[PDB]
């Protein structure tokens, strides 16, 4: 009977940077995706392993809404299999993924005239991530601040006069768990 909160994970006042991406575990409440359906705001609504026709006619054990904010040009790396910076060094999704990536465009919120140097992303790293991992180690990566030893993070610059490939697209990645066990969240 309980309607869960996609309201403290979707219309949030500030989303976490890519390299440190939030996550909420929702369970034990009926999941009404009818507030996600009827809206022309969301750019992307791409359900993997499930079809968005049936999301309201299924029962799961957990859902994992991972909020963050990436660059508009890089919202296609949030998908099983891709490559780049957001996929290798920041946030990698598993191949056998079953969820619904949802990445609308917030350019009025995450942008300033001179720049919005808050949202960051990890640019350098030894190996690529493992599915659903995160690391917050901001020590100076090496290939003192100087030659051949430069900090690993570099912030995003978000002015409103950027185009589209350089604007803030608040991504959200619902992740459903299909496990043979008592079903917790239903439709």
């Amino acid at each position, epitope marked *: 009977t309980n309607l869960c909160p996609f309201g403290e994970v979707f219309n949030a006042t500030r989303f976490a940077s890519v390299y440190a991406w939030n996550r909420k575990r929702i369970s034990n409440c009926v999941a009404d995706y009818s507030v996600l359906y009827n809206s022309a705001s969301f750019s992307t609504f791409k359900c993997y392993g499930v079809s968005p026709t049936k999301l309201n006619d299924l029962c799961f054990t957990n859902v994992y809404a991972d909020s963050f904010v990436i660059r508009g040009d890089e919202v296609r790396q949030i998908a099983p299999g891709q490559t780049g910076k957001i996929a290798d060094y920041n946030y990698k999704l598993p191949d056998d993924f079953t969820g619904c990536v949802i990445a609308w465009n917030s350019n009025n919120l995450d*942008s300033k005239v001179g720049g919005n*140097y808050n949202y960051l992303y990890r640019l350098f790293r030894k190996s690529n991530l493992k599915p659903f991992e995160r690391d917050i180690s*901001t020590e100076i990566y090496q290939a003192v601040e100087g030659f051949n030893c430069y900090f690993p993070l570099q912030s995003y610059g978000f002015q409103p006069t950027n185009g589209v490939g350089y604007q803030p697209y608040r991504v959200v990645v619902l992740s459903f768990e299909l496990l043979h066990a008592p079903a917790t969240v239903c439709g």
Partner: antibody
Amino acid sequence: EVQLQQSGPELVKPGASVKISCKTSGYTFTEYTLHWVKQSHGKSLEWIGGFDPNFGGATYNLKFEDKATLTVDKSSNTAYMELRSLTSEDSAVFYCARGDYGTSYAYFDFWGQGTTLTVSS
Amino acid sequence: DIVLTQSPASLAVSLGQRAAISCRASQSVSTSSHNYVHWYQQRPGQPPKLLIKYASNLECGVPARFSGSGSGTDFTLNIHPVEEEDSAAYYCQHSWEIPYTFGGGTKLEIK
């Protein structure tokens, strides 16, 4: 120019309602977040968490999510604060800080006079 | 929740010599372009006012004697000429992550 003044000093009983207002005038209100900062008896400053005018939402600090709620009536040029169920430890000076445009603030440009809050019976 | 420790917690200076105040952070709040620490100054009964923003760039409209610098974990603030107005708490701050925290704060006293 930018000048903020809050409400007068307010004495509080433990666990009561208080509305520390902050009337802002000197710039376009929809282009600058209005944060809040607390300092208690020579304490270091701790950030309460601040509103965002254009979005209509707020981003609180983890330790203050329970007792602080922020409200805005954008036409009245004011961003409010509220303390309820407050413990005897939090009787301080609340600075109606100022930041930058939404979700882009780093440095607090202008502050307020200060609302000396004292909790007693 | 990054914590900011400053020392000396109470500094003694002569009205003409060089001064130095340091604020060391838990993490390394720094990027190859922006250092994230912003210093402040609070006299008794006064709200702080931003001395330096992003640890190098000075605000416009201050006595312009404050020049600071620092890259990575440790930051340093400077007051090369000192006088009566510089008797205040010289706080610290980081804009790294959502929980914003101000340092302990050192006090300056003239000799």
